[PDB]
Amino acid sequence: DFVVIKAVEDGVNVIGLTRGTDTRFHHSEKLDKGEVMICQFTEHTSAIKVRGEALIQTANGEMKSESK
Amino acid sequence: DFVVIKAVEDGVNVIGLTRGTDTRFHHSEKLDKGEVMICQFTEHTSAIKVRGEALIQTANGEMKSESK
Amino acid sequence: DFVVIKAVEDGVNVIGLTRGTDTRFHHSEKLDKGEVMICQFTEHTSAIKVRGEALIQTANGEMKSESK
Amino acid sequence: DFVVIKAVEDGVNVIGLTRGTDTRFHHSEKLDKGEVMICQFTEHTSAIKVRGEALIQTANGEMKSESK
Amino acid sequence: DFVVIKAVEDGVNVIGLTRGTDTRFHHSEKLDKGEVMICQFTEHTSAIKVRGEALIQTANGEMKSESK
Amino acid sequence: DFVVIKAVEDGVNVIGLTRGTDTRFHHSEKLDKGEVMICQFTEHTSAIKVRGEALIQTANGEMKSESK
Amino acid sequence: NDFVVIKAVEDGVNVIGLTRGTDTRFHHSEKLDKGEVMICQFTEHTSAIKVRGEALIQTANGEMKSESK
Amino acid sequence: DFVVIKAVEDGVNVIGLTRGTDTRFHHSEKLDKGEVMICQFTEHTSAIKVRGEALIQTANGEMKSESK
Amino acid sequence: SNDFVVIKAVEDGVNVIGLTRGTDTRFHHSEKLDKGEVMICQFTEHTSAIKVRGEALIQTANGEMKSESK
Amino acid sequence: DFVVIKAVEDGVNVIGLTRGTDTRFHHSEKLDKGEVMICQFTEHTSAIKVRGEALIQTANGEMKSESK
Amino acid sequence: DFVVIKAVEDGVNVIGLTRGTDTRFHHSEKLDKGEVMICQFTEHTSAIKVRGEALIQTANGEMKSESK
Ligand SMILES: N[C@@H](Cc1c[nH]c2ccccc12)C(=O)O
Ligand SMILES: N[C@@H](Cc1c[nH]c2ccccc12)C(=O)O
Ligand SMILES: N[C@@H](Cc1c[nH]c2ccccc12)C(=O)O
Ligand SMILES: N[C@@H](Cc1c[nH]c2ccccc12)C(=O)O
Ligand SMILES: N[C@@H](Cc1c[nH]c2ccccc12)C(=O)O
Ligand SMILES: N[C@@H](Cc1c[nH]c2ccccc12)C(=O)O
Ligand SMILES: N[C@@H](Cc1c[nH]c2ccccc12)C(=O)O
Ligand SMILES: N[C@@H](Cc1c[nH]c2ccccc12)C(=O)O
Ligand SMILES: N[C@@H](Cc1c[nH]c2ccccc12)C(=O)O
Ligand SMILES: N[C@@H](Cc1c[nH]c2ccccc12)C(=O)O
Ligand SMILES: N[C@@H](Cc1c[nH]c2ccccc12)C(=O)O
User: Which of F13, F34, F51, K11 has the fewest CB atoms within 10 Å of its CB?
Assistant: First the structure.
């Protein structure tokens, strides 16, 4: 399973959270206005956090996030 | 199987429950207004609880969380 | 294979019965009004009982549970 | 797979029958009005029986069991 | 795969036939009016026979067994 | 995969043919009017023949046979 | 392993099975009389099926008919 | 996967092609008007060719072949 | 579930070419199809790419396609 | 999965990129007006580049490339 | 799983982020206007980033990227 993320505005952050007993930030990808990121769930990433104004697509539909 | 969760307002709390014989929360991710989280059921998480005002998506359809 | 449970009122319990020759209650997750709980069937949970008023989602459609 | 059972009246019984060369009632889960039970077919259970007024959801469709 | 059976009238027989070289009924399960039986194909049951007035659901459609 | 067979009148025979090098009948299941049979293909049965007036359902739809 | 449904609309329908392997040849012909229905699988021994006679045929790939001769 | 081939006329040829480094026909099944042939791809058959006026069916839909 | 291709030759002179799987890529066989003949073939341990020349009707799980000659 | 590429003009090139740590072209297949190439992702090809004017069909829909 | 990317502007940038504990780009493939790149997630690429104006296709539908 993967998630699609389009940055509608500057400052969007695609954060990865560690898989396992411990849960913490292990990476944050900065997406500029109009950039798109397609990312999977991996051995290392069992959860993903999105901040900023962005369009999101998953196998389970579409979603929106806003800044501030 | 993954769950998508949108924080409609501040105070949304995404909680993970341990897999196996015992059942406790091992993690709580708090989302601010607009932040989106996408998490899987995993080796360590077999049940998930959503607290606060949130939009929720699973393979089984959409659902809304209510705070208080 | 998961079940989604939104509690329509306070005092809602999501009970888990054990897998194996024996069938007994091993845990009860209390849900306050508006709280949503997504949970799986597991090596330890092979059946689930929902007591109280709530909205239920499975791959096999939707169901509602009434309080006493 | 799994079967969803919603007791529409008090005294709805959900019996588990043993898998294997022997066929026996190995457990009886009593359901009262409103309560909902989602249960699987397992190593130990290959056939399920339902007595009482209840709503039933499987993959093959919906079904109803009468009381008396 | 599983078969959903609901007895329309009393004394319905759900007959399991043996998997393997030979073919005899290893079991007969009586369902009373309004009761519902859900049973799988198993290591021991490769054929099932319904005798009496009952409603039948499988993945391949719906069918009715008749009294006399 | 399995076959569903309803006897439209007395004298319906569900015949199983041996899987493997040989091809002979190893069992005939006599179905009376109104009865329903649900059989799989198996390590012992790789071909099934129906004789008499019956309604049949498979994952490929429905089909009827006529007697005499 | 997909199967084939066959109903004989008339008398003298043959359901032939051809051997699986490097050699291809008939190993069995099942006679179906009018109205009879046969449902057969593809097996270790049978990789090809031949239908002779007027019959109705059902596979995962749709419906088909056959005529005598 | 399997092919379904119906001869619309006499002179229909169902040709089997060899799996492996080499590619040549190892069998030619001759079909007369009205006859139907269903055949799989196999350890020995990784391609099939149809000659003659025939009606063909595959998972990718239908197709007619013309003789000459 | 090992995918396959369906190819019907609209006119004569149709070639169904098979390219090799592995480090290298070359034609290891060309099947000539003539007007009206149909060919269904799989990708395999030896065939991972297929090139079609001439005028034909093509069918795959991803839809339909036509090819022209010249 | 696999890709269908239909050359709409002369000078169509279908390029395969290497799978593994290193990413580089390992082949380029020319296509002339009218020709159709059908190709798989493989052990050696994990990325595919299409240059020129062509029609493209994937499991994720159609797409048209242009030349110049 | 694979991603389809058509460039609507010269110098489009398709970036592959490394699979594993560390997340950095191991490759940047350029696409000029009209060119199409079809690529997979691999043992080495667990996340993809698109920079520049382009059409993007995935199993989860369509998405556009904008440059600047
Ligand atoms: N190196 C990361 C790449 C990754 C995938 N999904 C992500 C989500 C957020 C941040 C990084 C990622 C991994 O393989 O796990
Ligand atoms: N470390 C947790 C991360 C996690 C995934 N899904 C979750 C849901 C809620 C809380 C934490 C999580 C895990 O891999 O299991
Ligand atoms: N620790 C429990 C968590 C659980 C999953 N599903 C449930 C249903 C009810 C109660 C608890 C649960 C388990 O892994 O099985
Ligand atoms: N311990 C039983 C619980 C069970 C599952 N499904 C059931 C249906 C009816 C009664 C009991 C059950 C089991 O794992 O098999
Ligand atoms: N012990 C039997 C119980 C059973 C399952 N499905 C059935 C259908 C009919 C009769 C009995 C059964 C079995 O596991 O096979
Ligand atoms: N003993 C038989 C039972 C059976 C299954 N399907 C059938 C069809 C016809 C006759 C018998 C059967 C078997 O396991 O193979
Ligand atoms: N003994 C045969 C039964 C069979 C299956 N499919 C058939 C088609 C035609 C004739 C016989 C059959 C076999 O296993 O192969
Ligand atoms: N022995 C051949 C029979 C066969 C199957 N499919 C075919 C298609 C064409 C010709 C022959 C065949 C094989 O298994 O491969
Ligand atoms: N012997 C070839 C047969 C083949 C299958 N598909 C093809 C496409 C083109 C040419 C030959 C073929 C192979 O197994 O690979
Ligand atoms: N030898 C190459 C053939 C190939 C398959 N798909 C392709 C796409 C483009 C170029 C070449 C190819 C391979 O096995 O991988
Ligand atoms: N060698 C790379 C090729 C690749 C696949 N998908 C990509 C996406 C972007 C950049 C490169 C790639 C790999 O297999 O992973």
Answer: K11
